[PDB]
Amino acid sequence: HWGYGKHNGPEHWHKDFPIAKGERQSPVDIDTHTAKYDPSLKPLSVSYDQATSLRILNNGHAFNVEFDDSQDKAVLKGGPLDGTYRLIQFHFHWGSLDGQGSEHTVDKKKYAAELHLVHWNTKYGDFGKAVQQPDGLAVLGIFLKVGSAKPGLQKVVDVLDSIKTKGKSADFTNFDPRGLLPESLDYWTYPGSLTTPPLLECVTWIVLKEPISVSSEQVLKFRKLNFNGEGEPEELMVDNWRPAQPLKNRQIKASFK
């Protein structure tokens, strides 16, 4: 099945998921000179004070930090969005080396990693229904550069040993995702897709301009994870990013001047 190797990576996905060659695929390159400022865009409202993290899971493609999404406890609103989007999980994409790892690029620059906070539109009742709708999801994307450590990431880093291989989970309560955000909420936005199969075209992307800094030691720990299950040949979980896809008939809008 699908993955990030030579034989099963992004360049193969279209055979099982023909929407891979669709009109609104993600990620994309953000050309900062052609993204236009849209004064009609609102500030983003990120309301994470009541967020309830539950568990962390290695799904064989990344690790997900999962939230209780059975009530409006952590929500995204405003910005480009109409209505209320509930946080369900976050995860990262990262590289084998610090010079690659992000999915989106900025003027063809690749960051070391990219954080995706995934939210679903409450008007559709559940995640599974939301991903069938063109406005079903809102994903907040945050770039990671290597420099100073991110204190708010360390709790995630230190549990990774317990979820080394595919299918492992661990309790992960009381984690506050506010500690993963940069200072500024200035963003770019465009309509796109999930970046992993099934590649559904259901996402409003909100990509923050300001990266967070993580330390080399933090990223090194991500790269010790495994794609494989327990007692299988070890294949380090690295380079779990899809490259930029054609922009097609889309415009990228900026919230800032």
Flag whether 104 is marked binding.
no
**Only segment of 7-15, 75-83, 111-119, 200-208 that touches Zn ion (CB under 5 A):** 111-119
Name residues contacting Zn ion, limited to 170-189 (CB under 5 A). none
Residue 116, interface with Zn ion (CB under 5 A)?
yes
Q: Is-catalytic flag, 1?
A: no
CB of 115 to Zn ion, least distance (A): 8
Flag whether 7 is marked binding.
no
**Only segment of 10-18, 45-53, 114-122, 223-231 that touches Zn ion (CB under 5 A):** 114-122
CB of 116 to Zn ion, least distance (A): 4
**What's the CA gap between 169 and 190, in Å, rounded?**
33
Flag whether 116 is marked binding.
yes
Q: Where does the chain show beta strands of DSSP type E?
A: 29-30, 36-37, 44-47, 53-58, 63-67, 75-78, 85-94, 105-106, 113-121, 137-146, 169-171, 187-192, 203-208, 212-214, 253-254
Flag whether 195 is marked binding.
yes
Nearer residue to Zn ion within complex by CB, 118 or 148: 118
- Give the H or E element holding residue 14: helix 13-16
**What's the CA gap between 69 and 80, in Å, rounded?**
21
Place of tokens 């500030």: 43
Nearer residue to Zn ion within complex by CB, 116 or 168: 116
Flag whether 93 is marked binding.
yes
**What's the CA gap between 118 and 115, in Å, rounded?**
10
CB of 36 to Zn ion, least distance (A): 26
Q: Count the neighbouring beta carbons within 10 Å of the beta carbon of residue 136.
A: 22
Place of tokens 């990120």: 46
Could you tell me which residues are annotated as the binding site? 91, 93, 116, 195-196
Could you tell me which residues are annotated as the binding site for substrate? 195-196
Residue numbers at the binding site for Zn ion (CB under 5 A): 116
Q: Among all residues, which ones are annotated catalytic?
A: 61
